[PDB]
């Protein structure tokens, strides 16, 4: 029983910006706001607003708004970063900067001599090597890029066997800190993709079960 040894890697991009809220979560947010300010004790700003609103009414017959309008204008004048750097492009699946809300994963295109391969990035390890070392090595080597990715465990994520011979595909989880992609226009096709899209582009049953150990968020 000859055993073909193949390491493999599940590469996780951190979600950058927070998601919008479900209608229910929104109504609940409103409620929590209301009740929070309902049980609240005074305010310094509201002390100086109300006490002076009354005391000026007593100095007329016998501030706060300034600050309000100041902060209004200093907020309104300022402008913020776009929540969508994806849909303004609306095209690139290959951009690492694509989706801010979700976590993203790397795919590659390869056409081998006898085969057509859409590939979650794979490794090949010699018996003397550790699956770990081969994971890292394959990562840094294949993508032609400088990647800081903090790995989690020494234990692998999920495993799928193709037996013609017999063979193994061992998927590992790597958490991407900061990648630097050299030659952003290289021919090798690297696709950065969410959960639904990972469901779409993946033909095999070996790569079909990767969304089983993936974090659906």
């Amino acid at each position: 029983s000859p055993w073909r040894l193949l390491g493999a890697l599940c590469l996780q991009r951190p979600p950058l910006v927070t998601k919008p809220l479900t209608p229910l979560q929104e109504e609940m947010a409103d409620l929590l706001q209301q009740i929070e300010i309902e049980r609240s004790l005074y305010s310094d700003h509201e002390l100086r607003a109300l006490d002076e609103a009354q005391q000026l009414a007593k100095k007329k017959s016998d501030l706060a708004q300034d600050l309000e309008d100041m902060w209004e204008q200093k907020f309104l004048h300022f402008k913020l970063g776009a929540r969508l750097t994806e849909a303004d492009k609306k095209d690139d699946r290959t951009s690492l900067h694509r989706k801010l809300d979700r976590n993203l994963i790397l795919l590659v295109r390869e056409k081998l001599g006898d085969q057509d391969i859409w590939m979650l990035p794979q490794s090949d390890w010699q018996p003397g090597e550790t699956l770990r070392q081969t994971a890292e090595r394959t990562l840094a080597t294949l993508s032609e890029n400088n990647m800081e990715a903090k790995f989690l465990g020494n234990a692998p994520c999920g495993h799928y066997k193709f037996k013609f011979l017999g063979a193994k595909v061992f998927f590992f989880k790597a958490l991407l800190l900061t990648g630097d992609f050299s030659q952003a226009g290289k021919k090798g096709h690297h696709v950065w993709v969410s959960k639904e899209e990972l469901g779409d582009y993946l033909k095999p049953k070996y790569l079909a079960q990767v969304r089983r150990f993936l974090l659906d968020l």
Binding site: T18, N103, L152, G153, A155, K173, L175, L215, L217
Partner: protein
């Protein structure tokens, strides 16, 4: 009574006990005494996520030993004024810290755990994993 069959029927104390190293064996590998530092600027948020961690642990059978708050660090931020050249202005902030200690783990459970923790991270929440030795 010692002679009788019913002896020691009322025996209890072995049921209730009323009276630190990581174990690394390389195959069954138990790495314990771990510190979770949840640090954030907002009180409510930090407490809430600390809470979520605690409850999550209790559900996963992972043993929590001590859950406690670290001393808040009071920040005084000095912002430059444009009119006066070297003139300073001020704004006050505060850093809040919570701590959850877990007593045991395995490789697989470490991998899983961290996934769940960082997946559920709220905005403005800084997470840390460390070792039991710390000085208050």
């Amino acid at each position: 009574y010692r002679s009788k069959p019913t002896h020691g029927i009322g025996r209890y104390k072995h049921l209730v006990k009323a009276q630190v190293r990581p174990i690394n064996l390389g195959t069954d590998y138990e790495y314990g005494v771990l510190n979770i530092h949840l640090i954030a600027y907002d009180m409510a948020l930090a407490e809430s996520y600390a809470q979520y961690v605690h409850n999550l642990c209790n559900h996963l059978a992972i043993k929590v030993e001590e859950s406690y708050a670290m001393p808040t660090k009071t920040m005084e931020v000095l912002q430059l004024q444009e009119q006066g050249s070297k003139m300073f202005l001020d704004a006050v902030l505060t850093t809040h810290e919570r701590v959850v200690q877990i007593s045991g783990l395995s490789a697989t459970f470490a991998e899983i755990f961290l996934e769940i923790i960082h997946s559920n991270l709220p905005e403005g929440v800084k997470l840390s994993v460390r070792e039991h030795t710390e000085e208050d």
